[PDB]
């Protein structure tokens with residue numbers, strides 16, 4: 702019911718501001734949060750901030766004084782502005798909509814590529830996904846793990862699948878709930894600092910990257926990712 706599309710320049714010189722736009726389309730919305738998320742080369746995902754339905758914003762301490770996220774409800778649009786960019790800000794940037802009442806679904810944009818041609822202070826939970834890389838055969842039972850640096854609520858640990866050329870799709874919510882579009886051969890489990898995704902029977906189509914994610918504690922964070930391959 703919701704489509705998001707990111708725009709802006711794909712190249713930027715350092716110190717310039719980055720300005721991006723999220724043109725949000727489709728169905729009317731009575732609450733929720735529009736978030737910006739960025740993905741580096743090598744695929745580390747970075748939760749930047751959000752603006753809510755009521756104009757409330759939240760920024761990742763790591764960005765604090767460089768970032769602003771604004772709205773233009775009349776133009777049905779959300780914006781990202783980031784000051785003093787450097788090469789470290791080279792990423793694919795995504796906007797995404799989520800309804801706090803609707804745990805089960807998340808909307809992501811296409812994602813825009815942006816290449817780049819201080820204060821803050823905070824703490825974050827680290828999420829570790831090992832192996833970095835896995836090859837299993839058609840038919841094999843596969844288990845993916847996510848270990849957190851401190852406890853998180855099991856209700857706010859989530860998994861995403863992503864495929865080359867495309868954006869993370871929500872795969873599992875609240876530890877063990879599969880999302881729409883996910884075959885029931887997948888499962889999830891765990892509690893405290895230890896979570897896993899399971900595929901009872903690996904199929905060729907399941908090879909992709911998997912990211913766990915935590916939003917039990919601010920800022921939200923993603924795991925380093927397990928890339929899952931097929932054999933032969």
Ligand SMILES: C[C@H](N)Cc1ccccc1
Nearest residue numbers: 734736751799807916921
């Ligand atoms: C990343 C979360 N699934 C989305 C979210 C959650 C809470 C607030 C804002 C956005």
